[PDB]
Amino acid sequence: MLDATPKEIVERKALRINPAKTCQPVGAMYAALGIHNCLPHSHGSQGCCSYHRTVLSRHFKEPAMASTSSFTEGASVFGGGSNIKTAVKNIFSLYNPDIIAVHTTCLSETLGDDLPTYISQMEDAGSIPEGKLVIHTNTPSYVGSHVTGFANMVQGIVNYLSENTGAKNGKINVIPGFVGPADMREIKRLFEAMDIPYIMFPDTSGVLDGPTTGEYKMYPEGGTKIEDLKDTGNSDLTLSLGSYASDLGAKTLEKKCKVPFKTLRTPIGVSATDEFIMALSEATGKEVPASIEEERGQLIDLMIDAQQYLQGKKVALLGDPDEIIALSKFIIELGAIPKYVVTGTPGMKFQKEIDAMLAEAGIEGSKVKVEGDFFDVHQWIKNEGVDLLISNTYGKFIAREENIPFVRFGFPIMDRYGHYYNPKVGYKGAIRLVEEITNVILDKIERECTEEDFEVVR
Amino acid sequence: MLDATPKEIVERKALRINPAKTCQPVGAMYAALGIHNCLPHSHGSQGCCSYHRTVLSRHFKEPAMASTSSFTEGASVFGGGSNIKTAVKNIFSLYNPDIIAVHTTCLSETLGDDLPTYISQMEDAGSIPEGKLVIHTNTPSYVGSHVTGFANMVQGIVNYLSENTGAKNGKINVIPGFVGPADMREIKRLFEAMDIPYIMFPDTSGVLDGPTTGEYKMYPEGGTKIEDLKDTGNSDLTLSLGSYASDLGAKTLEKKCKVPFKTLRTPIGVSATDEFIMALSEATGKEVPASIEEERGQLIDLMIDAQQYLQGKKVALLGDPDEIIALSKFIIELGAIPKYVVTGTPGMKFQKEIDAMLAEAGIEGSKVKVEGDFFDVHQWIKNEGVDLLISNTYGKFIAREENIPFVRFGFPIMDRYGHYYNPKVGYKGAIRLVEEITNVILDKIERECTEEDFEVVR
Amino acid sequence: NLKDEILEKYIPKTKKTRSGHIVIKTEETPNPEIVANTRTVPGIITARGCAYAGCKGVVMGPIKDMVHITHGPIGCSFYTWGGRRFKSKPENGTGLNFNEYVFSTDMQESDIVFGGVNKLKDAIHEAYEMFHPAAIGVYATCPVGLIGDDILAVAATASKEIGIPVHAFSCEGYKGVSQSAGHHIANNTVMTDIIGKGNKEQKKYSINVLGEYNIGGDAWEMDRVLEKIGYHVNATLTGDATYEKVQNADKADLNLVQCHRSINYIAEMMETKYGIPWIKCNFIGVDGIVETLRDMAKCFDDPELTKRTEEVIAEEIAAIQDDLDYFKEKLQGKTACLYVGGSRSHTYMNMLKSFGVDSLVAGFEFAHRDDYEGREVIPTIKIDADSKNIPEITVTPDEQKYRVVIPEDKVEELKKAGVPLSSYGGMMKEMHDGTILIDDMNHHDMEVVLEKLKPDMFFAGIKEKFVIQKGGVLSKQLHSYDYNGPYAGFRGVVNFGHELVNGIYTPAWKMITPPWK
Amino acid sequence: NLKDEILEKYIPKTKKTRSGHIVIKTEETPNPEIVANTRTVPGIITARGCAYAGCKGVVMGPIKDMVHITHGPIGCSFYTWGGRRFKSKPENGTGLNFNEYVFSTDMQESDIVFGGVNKLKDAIHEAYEMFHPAAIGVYATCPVGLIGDDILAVAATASKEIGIPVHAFSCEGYKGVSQSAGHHIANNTVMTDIIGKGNKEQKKYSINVLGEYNIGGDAWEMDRVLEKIGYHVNATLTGDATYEKVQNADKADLNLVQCHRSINYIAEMMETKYGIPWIKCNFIGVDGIVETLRDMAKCFDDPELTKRTEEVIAEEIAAIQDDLDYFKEKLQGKTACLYVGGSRSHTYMNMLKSFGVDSLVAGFEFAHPEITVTPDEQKYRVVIPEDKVEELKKAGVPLSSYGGMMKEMHDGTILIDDMNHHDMEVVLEKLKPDMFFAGIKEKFVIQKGGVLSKQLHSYDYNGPYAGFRGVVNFGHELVNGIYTPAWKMITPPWK
Numbered sequence A, B: 001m002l003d004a005t006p007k008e009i010v011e012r013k014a015l016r017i018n019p020a021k022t023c024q025p026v027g028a029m030y031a032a033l034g035i036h037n038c039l040p041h042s043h044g045s046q047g048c049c050s051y052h053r054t055v056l057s058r059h060f061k062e063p064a065m066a067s068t069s070s071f072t073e074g075a076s077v078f079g080g081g082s083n084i085k086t087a088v089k090n091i092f093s094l095y096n097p098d099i100i101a102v103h104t105t106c107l108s109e110t111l112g113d114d115l116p117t118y119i120s121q122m123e124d125a126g127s128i129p130e131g132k133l134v135i136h137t138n139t140p141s142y143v144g145s146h147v148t149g150f151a152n153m154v155q156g157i158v159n160y161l162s163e164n165t166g167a168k169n170g171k172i173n174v175i176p177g178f179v180g181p182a183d184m185r186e187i188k189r190l191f192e193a194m195d196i197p198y199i200m201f202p203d204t205s206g207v208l209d210g211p212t213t214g215e216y217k218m219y220p221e222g223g224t225k226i227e228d229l230k231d232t233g234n235s236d237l238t239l240s241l242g243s244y245a246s247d248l249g250a251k252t253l254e255k256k257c258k259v260p261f262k263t264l265r266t267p268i269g270v271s272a273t274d275e276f277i278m279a280l281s282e283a284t285g286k287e288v289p290a291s292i293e294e295e296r297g298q299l300i301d302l303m304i305d306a307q308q309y310l311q312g313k314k315v316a317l318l319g320d321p322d323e324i325i326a327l328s329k330f331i332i333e334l335g336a337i338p339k340y341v342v343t344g345t346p347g348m349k350f351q352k353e354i355d356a357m358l359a360e361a362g363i364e365g366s367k368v369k370v371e372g373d374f375f376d377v378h379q380w381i382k383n384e385g386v387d388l389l390i391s392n393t394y395g396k397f398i399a400r401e402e403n404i405p406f407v408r409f410g411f412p413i414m415d416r417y418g419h420y421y422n423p424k425v426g427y428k429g430a431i432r433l434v435e436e437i438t439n440v441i442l443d444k445i446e447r448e449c450t451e452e453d454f455e456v457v458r
Numbered sequence C: 001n002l003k004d005e006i007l008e009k010y011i012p013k014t015k016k017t018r019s020g021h022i023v024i025k026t027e028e029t030p031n032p033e034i035v036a037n038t039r040t041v042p043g044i045i046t047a048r049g050c051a052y053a054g055c056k057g058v059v060m061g062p063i064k065d066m067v068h069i070t071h072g073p074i075g076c077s078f079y080t081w082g083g084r085r086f087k088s089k090p091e092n093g094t095g096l097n098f099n100e101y102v103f104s105t106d107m108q109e110s111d112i113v114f115g116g117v118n119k120l121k122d123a124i125h126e127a128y129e130m131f132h133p134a135a136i137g138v139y140a141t142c143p144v145g146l147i148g149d150d151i152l153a154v155a156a157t158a159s160k161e162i163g164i165p166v167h168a169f170s171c172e173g174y175k176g177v178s179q180s181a182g183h184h185i186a187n188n189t190v191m192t193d194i195i196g197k198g199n200k201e202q203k204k205y206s207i208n209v210l211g212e213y214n215i216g217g218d219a220w221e222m223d224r225v226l227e228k229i230g231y232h233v234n235a236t237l238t239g240d241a242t243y244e245k246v247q248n249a250d251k252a253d254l255n256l257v258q259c260h261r262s263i264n265y266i267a268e269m270m271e272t273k274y275g276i277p278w279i280k281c282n283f284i285g286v287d288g289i290v291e292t293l294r295d296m297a298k299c300f301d302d303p304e305l306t307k308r309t310e311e312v313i314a315e316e317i318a319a320i321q322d323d324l325d326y327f328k329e330k331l332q333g334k335t336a337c338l339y340v341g342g343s344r345s346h347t348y349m350n351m352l353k354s355f356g357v358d359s360l361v362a363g364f365e366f367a368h369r370d371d372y373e374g375r376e377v378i379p380t381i382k383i384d385a386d387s388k389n390i391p392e393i394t395v396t397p398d399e400q401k402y403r404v405v406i407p408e409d410k411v412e413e414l415k416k417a418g419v420p421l422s423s424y425g426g427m428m429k430e431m432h433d434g435t436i437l438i439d440d441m442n443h444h445d446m447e448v449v450l451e452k453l454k455p456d457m458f459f460a461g462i463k464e465k466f467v468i469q470k471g472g473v474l475s476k477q478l479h480s481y482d483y484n485g486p487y488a489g490f491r492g493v494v495n496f497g498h499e500l501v502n503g504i505y506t507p508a509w510k511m512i513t514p515p516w517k
Numbered sequence D: 001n002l003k004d005e006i007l008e009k010y011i012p013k014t015k016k017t018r019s020g021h022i023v024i025k026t027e028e029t030p031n032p033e034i035v036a037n038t039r040t041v042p043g044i045i046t047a048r049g050c051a052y053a054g055c056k057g058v059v060m061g062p063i064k065d066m067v068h069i070t071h072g073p074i075g076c077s078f079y080t081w082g083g084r085r086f087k088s089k090p091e092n093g094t095g096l097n098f099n100e101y102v103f104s105t106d107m108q109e110s111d112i113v114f115g116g117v118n119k120l121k122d123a124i125h126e127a128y129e130m131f132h133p134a135a136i137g138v139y140a141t142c143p144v145g146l147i148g149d150d151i152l153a154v155a156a157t158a159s160k161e162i163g164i165p166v167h168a169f170s171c172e173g174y175k176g177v178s179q180s181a182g183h184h185i186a187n188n189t190v191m192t193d194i195i196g197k198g199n200k201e202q203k204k205y206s207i208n209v210l211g212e213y214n215i216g217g218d219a220w221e222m223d224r225v226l227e228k229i230g231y232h233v234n235a236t237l238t239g240d241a242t243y244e245k246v247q248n249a250d251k252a253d254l255n256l257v258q259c260h261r262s263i264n265y266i267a268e269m270m271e272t273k274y275g276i277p278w279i280k281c282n283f284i285g286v287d288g289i290v291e292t293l294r295d296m297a298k299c300f301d302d303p304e305l306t307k308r309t310e311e312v313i314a315e316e317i318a319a320i321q322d323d324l325d326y327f328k329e330k331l332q333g334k335t336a337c338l339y340v341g342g343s344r345s346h347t348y349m350n351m352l353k354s355f356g357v358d359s360l361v362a363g364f365e366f367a368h369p370e371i372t373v374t375p376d377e378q379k380y381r382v383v384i385p386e387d388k389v390e391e392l393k394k395a396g397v398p399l400s401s402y403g404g405m406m407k408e409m410h411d412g413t414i415l416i417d418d419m420n421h422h423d424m425e426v427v428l429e430k431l432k433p434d435m436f437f438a439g440i441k442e443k444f445v446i447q448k449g450g451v452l453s454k455q456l457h458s459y460d461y462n463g464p465y466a467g468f469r470g471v472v473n474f475g476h477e478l479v480n481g482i483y484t485p486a487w488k489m490i491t492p493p494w495k
């Protein structure tokens, strides 16, 4: 397993191996599925759309609908204008979404396609039926990652939809960042327990974690309603969860509609969940109810009860920046050590936040890399080992080859069932994480001990 | 590991090895901690109380308070009357519970100690202060199991406290059986989602799964309140979940207070949860809400999504009768086979119920045994292997020796952290069960496949 | 009429273009003309992929000791990371195997604006120095031609410096209309620059299996039976292949063509250049396996081979007959539809029919007219604007290596005995009257079929699986095999049947409706 | 003062009995009279166990190739199923090891009403035929005497039919007042019916370690150091012991007594009967370990053994010194209380003191047939001649005697016999110690209050804690506990 990976590290500046990111468009496709009755649309060659729909189905074990402009060599010479006008005509009549959310590929971006022009030409020709909507964003794959793509699509939604009409709704907007449907559900549950009215967007709960009822519905029950997306411009405040995924939209909404915003870490672990709860309380004067305080105390109880298996444990983490920042802090809060910490998504923020929390905890000797990949981490592991690995499915190779306890986290997870029902955020999610971590640590201890070291209680 | 277990079998009628039960009193202590401000009391030699407190702490990673009559050799001659009277004086003055819930040991039962007399003498002598209560049950360890002990303490609660005052409360009583605090939480959540007023008793939620707040409270915030236990005689109906743990109390309540009852299976799996929900609907005329319907449809989605890993899998199960009956049903509902099915608790019902479901599914060649033990199951496995083992912690020896995917379930689980926060009942609990089953099946496949049979998607 | 029901909702322009892609095989016209290999209608919700998928992801990727470098932004590389289940083992237990890696140049904005050729050059050298593979591949993606990168020249410059082959593939995603264009692009370079470059000596009874990618171990199961009968499997293009085996592909006497769509260019060109004849290989389902093995025996015309062929067939059938009987008892009378890429539809229909299951509709992503109706229509076909750009390679006989493998006398007698030497009659030839075929099937089409025919099962891919299953209908995957297999060969019929019966009889299908409804 | 704060809430009668059980050990009275070994006050929330736990669970159970049958209802057996962490390995890789099993007669109502001797006889025979062990043990529980079962006779009859020893132990739970009575019951039968039945040849520099149960691998660690120096460890009673090694315990020249409370009857009787002297073994903490090793050296009085002893000590300490300095830097200045069963209180206090941790309160659960032996004719021998004993004592080696745990503790230490929940909570509230070591029943009670509680019985599922490597394990786990970040996150930020 991974035989070709040398132990000795030679300088590597061009060849990317086993990436810790994918390209923008699927992040925008995911955001778009968080709008009710929306068809995502991929403006480019159809290979992209098929691959992007595919990963979402492998991760969620659910349908993932989207259409494409299907560029051929013709569009490569003359641009994709005619392709997208043809698409929109077929989409509204065959499939009747309420809104089409268009993103782009490396192909249409390299060509410089002018979506705002095609869209106003479509309006003029009457190709967009009364009461239907077409929105877009630009998602060049050679910039950033899928996280950037999600961020760009959220900006698109506010560019086209959000309007301040004078009629205050008394609500808080929450942009949950690039997180799963179970996390969106948990964030909503906590708003509801504090008694705070809100609008969450995007929201993929009830879209990518849906029931089997015996009838297939092209547009599932969930997703934020268009009418509420319009209403986000009448809210009191926007909470932006995860700066990489969420800030662009929150800042855009502030510029466009004068809704102030506050940036928070993705609420994974103790401090980051505490900061989210304190923000809700400070913004509304509402008290923290007993239910929420009990959950927190149960998390603390677990952290203390299980402490011996966690203290000083060296952890390798790979993933998306917002989530890996928050999770790294939780690892430190558990008494463990983020040893190797990598994201494939470019940006200075990650390096600064990880370096800072490591210094605060007195931890020296860790490696933190922005635009690093799984091959980097594997080589690092061969030089100095770790006790725990946390990443998406693609860490399984390292986990097996190096015999490391492994926790699946982030995107995509394509090889276990039900993860899309399991929160990782809030006090409830933190409990789940501690269970998973201690479970795999204990499993290893028990697989490998001699029979004479075998234990009934742990 | 367990090298002394022969493969070839010689019938044992006297030597019990690695039992699939323990004695009544811990079940009674557990039921008692399900009463608010109650101190459980062990009427016998102090070694029992120490062992019984200890297993509850090993299982819950929590305090488990109880007092004891501390019989000495003298009691073996003059009975335990004087010991309990002295105990009660010390308990009220030092520890000041609102109720002392007494159970017995094999020693007091063998001696024929007469608790009703001692209690009425303490009453007459004034050793029980104004507003305080002492209740008892009889829990001979040579009869039945810990499940019988729970049943008996529930009957004791009813015998002493339940009163029909003519003042209807419009509530349904629910006796949840010998299940964990997370199961009690889930059952209550479902009542609340159905908008149905209820009294649950016993209720260990908030007692054996409680937070760390920085201050130790001898009597945790949870437990059913004495005033609500009295009020159980004014309810419209009692739901008895799991006949072994709960019918005795429910029948005793019908005879004493004229509250009718219905007996339901512990709500593990699809049919058993559906039966609980339909009973609640039918008793109240309340509609089943969208949230519960969505949960069920998610369970169904999961059972279908993960079907290939479950179909035809041979499963060995050991544990307590109400839980194993309902879990065996769920195993069949998953498309799998209950191959070896054992409880250490005596009674005909287990045998009948399991035989019946195997025959309904066309399953032959399974072995079902009442008053079997882990040594039995190990021998059977050596003759014909299984794909999955489900049992308490003590299954881990067989799991390791025979290399079998292993799911911890039931009582006691002393070697992982957080299980007492994880429901196994309802649609939510069934989802957690399916996740655990499919995870351990998948982990084994991946651990043992050759490198060229290694897989990114499953 | 199902065709009319499918077409009804399309707008006029679309209805007119789609109508020709739906046909029905009848007794009156058993080989109906179909419109195929045209551009996808924008917005219609296709399952098709791109030419890069066809080239890198499908044909070239499985060559295990060649480093495959995607020259593009990161997604093109990420989405070819283990999703397609070609199986590989290290040759002789020790050779290089890069199956667990994906390699790329990870193009950034600077590469788009200023050209990416310097980064590609550096990446090729880094791969060489780190891994010393047998060869390197460089695969174009959407931006590559547009930004001006000459990958052919970068590759040739690198190859001279590093001393191993470097092959460039211009498989930009927008070329052609589907994966098919990618197959063609790969075949051209494999033929001209890899096949015949080796020097190994030919063994007796040597065959190649062409257009076989060892998905889920299929090729190893094929090889198990072929080697038992007595053949030497010289090369499999390209499932579990080493570079050097492809280089020695010319060292065979007969080419078995499993996937005609993906590998027919190489089959034709090897016949022209080296004299090696081919036959269609149908290694899915008992009927196809047996016919393939009997056809092979007759080509070699060896009394021993022939006797062994019959002994092995008889013994492999006897070992699975109890399972076959079980499948039929459990499944007969059920109905299915299937949706494939470009091949295999009739063999799966035939395997299903051996279980008593009738197949009503066969959908396709991207099969060509020659795949449906036979190569005899290749003269009548005219390449439209969208596919005319893909080079058509021409080879000439190798004076020194050419050989008459089977004399023309024997070739004539074989065709009279029913052996289709160096020909292929198409998928529809074999299908039952009443079969409805849909080229470039889409979501709308699929949903009409489901609603009107109510099949018990609809076999497809990962994008459609959960769509079909949400409606209560079983959908087993024909590409990934739901992470099992093999499905090819004698043991494959058992794996397929076992998994199918397990799927149909899963209890949850009957629990979907809650008891309060 | 503390004694009076603890006593305050007790009702008058309880107050009077409990007063004698709490003492403050000072320079005025270097060892004040404590009341010990009295009945537990009913309802007071003790931690004590029963005589069956002391006999089967503690002393006898660790004998790995003997089948221990519990004669009683199922619980007595169930609660001795792996909770006490004596470690065993099969002898020479191949011998019998029953550590993962518990065996019972699983008494039912019919056994209570009509007697259980017939079920016990069948269970003995089934165990013999199924496992062919070195011996079988039969252990009484609460109902056994009362229902009229003569387990002595049942054992004797079965031993004669099956041809291996079957030992009956009348360890009914209600006997005595604590696990201590169970120790005594086991010791009598081990001394009279097992020790001395062997016939193996005695080796040079032979020692036994008595009252050592190999919890978490303790005995293997102590053997490592002892065998390095050059002793032959003849027998450990009973950690990782075979039945045969117990039978050959008389084949040694010196008995080390680790747990004096549990094994003193055997130490005293082996001296009387075989003339093997003993010394107290304190193999916890560097000071105890080195003092133990220097006393053993003085007893053999062999110049090479004495030299190797000092060489081993120096290198063992050198190997861990950096760990010990780290523990002191991280822990000095903190305070501890301890709560043990019957032993070890002072060794742990000493080890804690070597890290700069001061111990304020030491609690105990219970530290304090009567048989007589006489010199074996064919086997008695003077191992250390008459006044060589005198030479050793005048040079600080207490040969064949023990001073008591209290005489060696610093002044001011408060001691509580049969400590109860009420007492413990007063101590926690008044003294506010940084840590309070105890057992599983107390651990979560203490830790709910924001105080670290590492277990002194189960070692929190780690170990060894004995020996040189044990000091490092203990210190490492202790530092990890104190510095767990969650302790400082208990209060939420909205408070």
Ligand code: ICS
Pocket (backbone or CB within 6 Å): C054, C058, C084, C179, C211, C213, C215, C259, C260, C261, C262, C340, C341, C342, C343, C344, C478, C479, C480
């Ligand atoms: S190559 Fe083709 S789409 Fe012939 S691109 Fe596709 S591994 Fe399909 S129907 Mo995936 S023409 Fe192979 C195919 Fe068939 S990837 Fe595989 S299953 S037999």
Ligand code: ICS
Pocket (backbone or CB within 6 Å): D054, D058, D084, D179, D180, D213, D215, D259, D260, D261, D262, D340, D341, D342, D343, D344, D456, D457, D458
């Ligand atoms: S025998 Fe005794 S309670 Fe001396 S009954 Fe108890 S394995 Fe304790 S303080 Mo558990 S007199 Fe041993 C003991 Fe000490 S079980 Fe262990 S730790 S040194």
Ligand code: CLF
Pocket (backbone or CB within 6 Å): A023, A024, A025, A045, A046, A047, A048, A049, A051, A104, A105, A106, A107, A141, C050, C051, C052, C053, C072, C073, C074, C075, C076, C077, C079, C140, C141, C142, C171, C172, C173, C174
């Ligand atoms: S049709 Fe085919 S897969 Fe698509 S891009 Fe083009 S060659 Fe490639 Fe690539 S990086 Fe992402 S996945 Fe695309 S938007 Fe570009």
Ligand code: CLF
Pocket (backbone or CB within 6 Å): B023, B024, B025, B045, B046, B047, B048, B049, B051, B104, B105, B106, B107, B141, B142, D050, D051, D052, D053, D072, D073, D074, D075, D076, D077, D079, D140, D141, D142, D171, D172, D173, D174
């Ligand atoms: S003091 Fe000791 S442990 Fe107690 S019983 Fe008595 S010998 Fe035994 Fe046994 S079966 Fe259960 S645990 Fe008791 S109530 Fe009886």
Ligand SMILES: [Fe+2]
Pocket (backbone or CB within 6 Å): A060, A061, A062, B301, B302, B305, C466
């Ligand atoms: Fe699903």
Ligand SMILES: [Fe+2]
Pocket (backbone or CB within 6 Å): A301, A302, A305, B060, B061, B062, D444
């Ligand atoms: Fe706890």
